[PDB]
Design an enzyme around this catalytic site. Structure first.
Site, mmCIF file in Angstrom:
data_model
loop_
_atom_site.group_PDB
_atom_site.id
_atom_site.type_symbol
_atom_site.label_atom_id
_atom_site.label_comp_id
_atom_site.label_asym_id
_atom_site.label_seq_id
_atom_site.Cartn_x
_atom_site.Cartn_y
_atom_site.Cartn_z
ATOM 1 N N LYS A 236 0.764 -1.244 0.000
ATOM 2 C CA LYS A 236 0.000 0.000 0.000
ATOM 3 C C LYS A 236 0.804 1.310 0.000
ATOM 4 O O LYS A 236 0.545 2.164 -0.844
ATOM 5 C CB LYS A 236 -1.048 -0.035 1.124
ATOM 6 C CG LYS A 236 -1.886 1.225 1.275
ATOM 7 C CD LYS A 236 -2.926 1.053 2.387
ATOM 8 C CE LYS A 236 -3.744 2.320 2.600
ATOM 9 N NZ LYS A 236 -4.761 2.148 3.677
ATOM 10 N N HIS B 19 0.447 -6.086 -16.724
ATOM 11 C CA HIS B 19 -0.501 -5.230 -16.056
ATOM 12 C C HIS B 19 -1.379 -4.648 -17.136
ATOM 13 O O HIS B 19 -0.914 -4.523 -18.263
ATOM 14 C CB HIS B 19 0.226 -4.154 -15.280
ATOM 15 C CG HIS B 19 -0.628 -3.494 -14.372
ATOM 16 N ND1 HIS B 19 -1.472 -2.492 -14.735
ATOM 17 C CD2 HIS B 19 -0.820 -3.704 -13.065
ATOM 18 C CE1 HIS B 19 -2.167 -2.116 -13.664
ATOM 19 N NE2 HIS B 19 -1.784 -2.840 -12.651
#
EC number: 4.1.1.39
Lengths: 150, 416, 416, 149
Positions: free
Chosen positions: B142, B258
């Site tokens: 994060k 991705h």
């Protein structure tokens, strides 16, 4: 000046909406325009319609927005030559003029109003009619339709 | 138009086929629009596409499908970029159509065989990683300095995840330079592997402004012994992606793709390119893993998941598959589920995707190792339950609750 | 949400600014939506974007603009691909918004200076080509055919008077024509034309390729053969590859022509995706000496682009589609290329609309060289008329009719 | 055989001259057998010309089936049939039929025949089962009133 939308060749491929107007002619005159049915009753499903009066001639016009807006009081006037009716330049072609008798009162200075001319039927600017103090007209021209060509 | 729309044409085994959706402008007939699509996308007698079938979209007004064939010779061997300019280069700007969307492409075997395909593919990857019988797990960190970042990586891998991922937006910035990230991450991996006995890795982002920098980053990752690298194929480009995929095969490095910026061209349903097309294009270009996203339009999603994993997929319009696609023994691509997922969805994810997948998770009440533990436990519990015939779509609540009785970490997660 | 929407923030000289247009889902306030965009596109209280201004789109319901600032530190120096993943990576997929479009970006000087910019730029490009006082002309060769016959068509057209001849954007290397031979035969055509006419002529050889190595090989060969200019598709091939080629070009003295194939996929719909003016700015930073912008014969938006890619400083003006004042810090411009639907009748307008710093790429003449002749004459006549003081938007008909009497090639074109 | 609302701008499609003589169901086959087949838009005025005069005139926007008909075009008003007055009455109807395609060839295609009272629409297969290889008109479309909601 006058809104002019020209009907074109090949426009028959897919019209989604279309409207119907009675037809009056320059030769037929002002009387025919008074005679034409004003209220066309829409009991339509995909278009079914009935007219308050029986009428011999009908033009089928696409649902162009100005024509669609009129609804009741919609008429089409056939002219052999564009030049005489049009205050401006013409292409020497037959003219179809859509008029709304509901707005016949001359309130729009730039608005064009069909009137009975000495020669026949003419489209006149509102300001000009106001100069002659003509409070009422046959119909207020909404659209001018020009013929398909090559 | 009569030279492009041919209602009685049967496609050849070597033709490339494409399925488009469109809405024609007012006054434009569907057939004329279809013929135009074929012309705009091909020459416009053996170098032209042909529109062979047009049908309305059931339920949708002014909306049609068109099926267009293209001769094999119109495409450069081995090149995704050439296929795309030929098909989607300028047809989307065509004036007689309000909107155009590409739904599907059939790649003939003859063309599929000119492409490398995934560097390793599903079976090779399991063998290289020595991981069998289950989906793989990972997460994204994060938040940092490279060392602090490395500590976070260590804890997550040490705690039980198979992979840790770089944020897709961090390449190299004044606050953190890639060379240091690579060194500290690599150290974290090596410590975790040594301590757990398993194979662990990290999806180092090697996306770069130039091909030379892309290679430098990839080469450094190789020197450090990194088993896998990451690249953003849509932002970077297909030329760069293909280049990296060839490098990856030669050097034994798994490639993770991705899908950032895909929403720009596939989100709206009436314009642009459906993701499944991009997914096929990628399978041909390269990449071992591809983000698919989560489901927890599952029909359409599952449709492309099979298209990128299976050898032979029969056409099935209810799943969004327009053409039968024979992949001619080219290896598949692992889907990666991601976004909006936590242990609560573990049952569903296992049942929906099966074993040939990766589940990426976004914090846990007691920090990262408990985080990793809770996910590892939840997954194993779900897989074992599936193997016993338990219905994960209904019993999933109990499977997780029972698992929570032996694992305090999972219980802490389930508490919320 | 309130940690992102900050109505009382003044942007810094170093901030990257972006303007988005969006339509929120029913039930979602405009301010909350703006805050969300800033959040999705950013994050450490110095690593977050801030939404500083929200206003409705005049004349539209459920349509708003939002202005978001992003700290300089978030962007990798010199990298278009990093800027794009950061700004457009995931905001378009965000659930509280029905549709989202990116309208503009202000690149702070501090970031502009980290990019190469165009290899040569407009003034250098004129000096290299030794062409002054006018727009340049070219066309695309039809049939869009062996390398020998292709070379003949190129020769005749260049010899006939065009400055440039272009390869079809979809032909890289195909079974019926392999790039190595196209390059040899075209180069011969150029060399003969230059020797004969005494002018500098080029050809936009397509060096688009499936891999970086192949792209370089094609570019290197074009240099070996003495070709002054090469072509590349920046959107399909992508920015990593484009940037790489631009660097190569600057080092090697070759001009770079950028084609915009597939832009329609990204920006055609007015309410979703990325406006081409953004892509145009991104390209100016990445590289490219020439760029297809397309012709207009929205006018206002078009004029906006042209200034943005050519001027040193552009003042904000919403009526022209420019949201932010942009200072290019002496980076050179990109020469726009007009195309699509053009022939000599539009020559007057094209000259007046774009001025001298442009290239006009023409489509079919009734008599190749007569085509080149008709356009060369029409252009010179228009430029001279403009300098004298004629109004090309009104007198253009007479300028061409008179010119048509000097050269029957032009009359033949005007006659149709 | 599509069923279309008289909708303006839904499929925007738009602009044409096309006309059908209208019959009521109550009138029966006689009205259909008498309506003018050739309705020819021309000159430059574009006022439509019919080989014979007809009392009621309706146009069907030039959707693809309507454009296809050409000769034999007809429009048939159909009126309902509610057991309960409070239960909403079914809308009035209109049938665009190609009288030129009188012969029954398509089982799927509906065809216009005559009911005991008024007219009726019957499947081609049903008509062939009843041994009628002929019908008055072939229905090319279905009706639905302009709905703005």
């Amino acid at each position: 000046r006058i809104p002019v939308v020209r009907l074109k060749f090949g426009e028959v491929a897919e019209a989604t909406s279309v409207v119907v107007l009675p037809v009056c002619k320059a030769e037929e005159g002002e009387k025919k325009i008074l005679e034409a049915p004003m209220e066309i009753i829409a009991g339509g499903d995909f278009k079914v319609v009935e007219a308050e009066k029986g009428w011999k001639r009908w033009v089928v016009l696409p649902s162009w927005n100005p024509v669609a807006a009129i609804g009741k009081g919609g008429v089409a006037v056939s002219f052999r030559d564009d030049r005489k009716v049009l205050p401006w330049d013409g292409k020497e072609e037959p003219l179809l003029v859509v008029a709304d008798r509901v707005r016949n009162v001359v309130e729009a200075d730039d608005g064009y109003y069909l009137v009975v001319a000495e020669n026949g039927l003419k489209l006149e600017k509102g300001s000009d009619l106001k100069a002659r103090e003509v409070k009422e007209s046959l119909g207020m021209v909404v659209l001018v339709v020009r013929p398909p060509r090559e | 138009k009569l030279t492009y729309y041919t209602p009685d044409y049967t496609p050849k085994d070597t033709d490339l086929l494409a399925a488009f959706r469109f809405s024609p402008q007012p006054g434009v007939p569907a057939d004329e629009a279809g013929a135009a699509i074929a012309a705009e996308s091909s020459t416009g007698d053996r170098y032209k596409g042909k529109c062979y079938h047009i049908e309305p979209v059931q339920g949708e007004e002014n909306s049609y499908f068109a099926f267009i064939a293209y001769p094999l010779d119109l495409f450069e061997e081995g090149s995704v970029t050439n296929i795309l300019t030929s098909i989607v280069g300028n047809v989307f700007g065509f004036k007689a159509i309000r909107s155009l969307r590409l739904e599907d492409i059939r790649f003939p075997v003859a063309l599929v065989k000119t492409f490398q395909g995934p560097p390793h593919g599903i079976q090779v990857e399991r063998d290289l990683l020595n991981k069998y019988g289950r989906p793989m797990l990972g997460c994204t960190i994060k938040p940092l300095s490279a060392k602090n970042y490395g500590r976070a990586v260590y804890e997550c891998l040490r705690g039980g995840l198979d992979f840790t991922k770089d944020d897709e937006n961090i390449n190299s910035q004044p606050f953190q330079r890639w060379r240091d990230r690579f060194l500290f991450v690599a150290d974290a991996i090596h410590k975790s592997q040594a301590e757990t006995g398993e194979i662990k890795g990290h999806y180092l982002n090697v996306t770069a402004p130039t091909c030379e920098e892309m290679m430098k980053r990839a080469e450094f990752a190789k020197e450090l012994g990194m088993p896998i690298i990451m690249h953003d194929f849509l932002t970077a480009g297909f030329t760069a992606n293909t280049t990296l995929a060839k490098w990856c095969r030669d050097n034994g490095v798994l490639l993770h793709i991705h899908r950032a910026m895909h929403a720009v061209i596939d989100r709206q349903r009436n314009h642009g390119i459906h993701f499944r097309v991009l997914a096929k294009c990628l399978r041909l270009s390269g990449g071992d893993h591809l983000h698919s996203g989560t489901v927890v339009d599952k029909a359409s999603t599952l449709g492309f998941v099979d298209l990128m994993r299976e050898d032979h997929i029969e056409a099935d319009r209810s799943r969004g598959v327009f053409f039968t696609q024979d992949w001619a023994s080219m290896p598949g691509v692992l889907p990666v589920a991601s976004g909006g997922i936590h242990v609560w969805h573990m049952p569903a994810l296992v049942e929906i995707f099966g074993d040939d997948s990766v589940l990426q998770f976004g914090g846990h009440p007691w920090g990262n190792a408990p985080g990793a533990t809770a996910n590892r436990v939840a997954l194993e519990a779900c897989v074992q339950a599936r193997n016993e015939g338990r219905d994960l779509y209904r019993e999933g609540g109990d499977i997780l609750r029972e698992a929570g009785k032996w694992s305090p970490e999972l219980a802490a997660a389930l508490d919320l």
